[PDB]
């Protein structure tokens, strides 16, 4: 399961997304995904999406992932009132925007991300899909 | 800082006594440095403290 | 004290009559020995070197001086300003004066005497002539029982390669091995 | 680079002289030569100098790196200083020691006239 390295500081700030940022050129492979939308992505979502692909791709590839959790989130008991204060770290998250490629592939010809992505898109936010390699 | 004050004596007639707070926790030796006083204005020799 | 006369007459210099060198600035030259004598575990004695203070100047033509440490706490015990050795460095005439006892009369103790191995050679032809421990030379009051310490000697050259630094081993004879 | 250490000592001096501006006397020496030059109050050019290159010294001195040759330049730059009336002149030693040939030059410059 995905559990990122302990942060230098005990807690972090969540931060705002600009909802664009180009990152469409594949550099760990030759093809990937289309994002075309904006939102928040969690560690459990990218591990559940990895599970969906791991079950369909068996051991071929591997597949490289350009999204990784960036922040831990603070969580506390539900009954604590509004005011004081921030709890301990629980789940880890990242931000996604239209120019992201998310996942990068090359060693998996025609059995992943070439005809459909529906089975992995069902685990994710922003109704994602596959992309074809950019050559010109 | 929380250290003992002891004033140096002049070897001659002088209206001032220079106040020392010299640490004596590793240095038992005496302090002799010369100071200025605005009366005779030819420097004063100060002795015997801590 | 005669090497100073011969090193100026032909030793690695008559070479210049058959090889393409217009000055001694392209030929091998020897002018330095950066001597040292270590104290080792002397901090657990602290009384013998307190009286053997000129015992390195007994073999070197310069003024004795105790070297002070550059380390204040160590896993072998040291203290700030503790004396850690003695140098009594050889250059020029005192280096040629000192070299006249090396290999010629330094034979009271041996460990190979056929050339050992070319350590610290620097790719130039830097030659070993050390004795590991002092062997005692004839001067004054040298026949008695007296203690001896660690002594190692390398003769370093201005040559550019051991192909040309070896012109010294073509002017003198000493046992050599690579 | 032991040559650069002399230049560092000159950077120290050049920075220290920069707040003075004004007329400046620079002394420079080498193992065979010595010279001294007076720099203008705008810093952009020389006014007068003395150097062991002149046949007035170089034909009379048996070696130009000598003490008496440093004194010959000191006694010439002091003589040319009196010709151009220079006062409030700040001294500069080009990263060298003052002791030795720069002192032996200065000692004779204050023998040919005013201090210096």
């Amino acid at each position: 399961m995905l559990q990122p390295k302990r942060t230098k500081f005990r807690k972090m700030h969540k931060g705002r997304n600009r909802g664009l940022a180009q990152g469409t050129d594949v550099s760990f492979g030759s093809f990937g995904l289309k994002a075309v939308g904006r939102g928040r992505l969690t560690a459990r979502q990218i591990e559940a999406a990895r599970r969906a692909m791991t079950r369909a791709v068996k051991r071929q590839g591997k597949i490289w992932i350009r999204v990784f959790p960036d922040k831990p989130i603070t969580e506390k008991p539900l009954a604590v009132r509004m005011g004081k204060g921030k709890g301990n770290v629980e789940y880890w998250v990242a931000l996604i925007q239209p120019g992201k490629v998310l996942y990068e592939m090359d060693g998996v010809p025609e059995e992943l991300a070439r005809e459909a992505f529906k089975l992995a898109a069902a685990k994710l936010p922003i109704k994602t899909t596959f992309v074809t390699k950019t050559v010109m | 800082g929380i250290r003992e004050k002891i004033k140096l004596v002049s070897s001659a007639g002088t209206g001032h006594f220079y106040t020392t707070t010299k640490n004596k926790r590793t240095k038992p030796e005496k302090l002799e440095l010369k100071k200025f006083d605005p009366v005779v204005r030819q420097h004063v020799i100060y002795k015997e403290a801590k | 004290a005669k090497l100073h006369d011969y090193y100026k007459d032909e030793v690695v210099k008559k070479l210049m009559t058959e090889f393409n060198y217009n000055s001694v600035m392209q030929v091998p030259r020897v002018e330095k020995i950066t001597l040292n004598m270590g104290v080792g575990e002397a901090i657990a004695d602290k009384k013998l070197l307190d009286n053997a203070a000129a015992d390195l100047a007994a073999i070197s033509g310069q003024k004795p001086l105790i070297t002070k440490a550059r380390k204040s706490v160590a896993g072998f015990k040291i203290r700030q300003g503790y004396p850690i050795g003695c140098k009594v460095t050889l250059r020029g005439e005192r280096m040629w004066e000192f070299f006249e006892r090396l290999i010629t009369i330094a034979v009271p103790r041996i460990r190979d005497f056929r050339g050992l191995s070319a350590k610290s050679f620097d790719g130039r032809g830097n030659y070993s002539m050390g004795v590991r421990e002092q062997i005692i030379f004839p001067e004054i009051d040298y026949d008695k029982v007296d203690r001896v310490r660690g002594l190692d000697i390398t003769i370093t050259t201005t040559a550019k390669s051991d192909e040309e630094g070896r012109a010294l081993l073509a002017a003198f004879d000493f046992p050599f091995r690579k | 680079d032991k040559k650069s250490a002399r230049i560092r000592r000159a950077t120290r001096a050049r920075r220290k002289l920069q707040e003075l501006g004004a007329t400046r006397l620079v002394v420079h020496r080498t193992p065979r030569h010595i010279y001294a030059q007076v720099i203008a109050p705008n810093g952009s050019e020389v006014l007068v100098a003395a150097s062991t290159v002149e046949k007035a010294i170089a034909e009379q001195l048996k070696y130009t790196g000598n003490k008496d040759a440093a004194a010959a330049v000191g006694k010439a730059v002091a003589e040319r200083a009196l010709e151009k009336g220079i006062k409030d002149v700040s001294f500069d030693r080009s990263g060298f020691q003052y002791h030795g040939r720069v002192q032996a030059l200065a000692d004779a410059a204050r023998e040919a006239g005013l201090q210096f």
Partner: protein, 79 residues
Amino acid sequence: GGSTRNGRDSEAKRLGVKRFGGESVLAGSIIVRQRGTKFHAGANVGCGRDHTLFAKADGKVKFEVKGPKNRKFISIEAE
């Protein structure tokens, strides 16, 4: 957690800025804890215990572009 404090009241800002009046002495730059990023050049110097490049003569600032790469000096103008 908490107790990170930082404390209260500190400034040392905006005094080394724009056109000067050229008739009293000026700080030139009051940037905090200066040891080599700026320094002084030309006829002026500043060696104060609070790292101020305060000029000791009356004049205006040059806002000079000379000096090696990212090291630029506090200097007074000729007028």
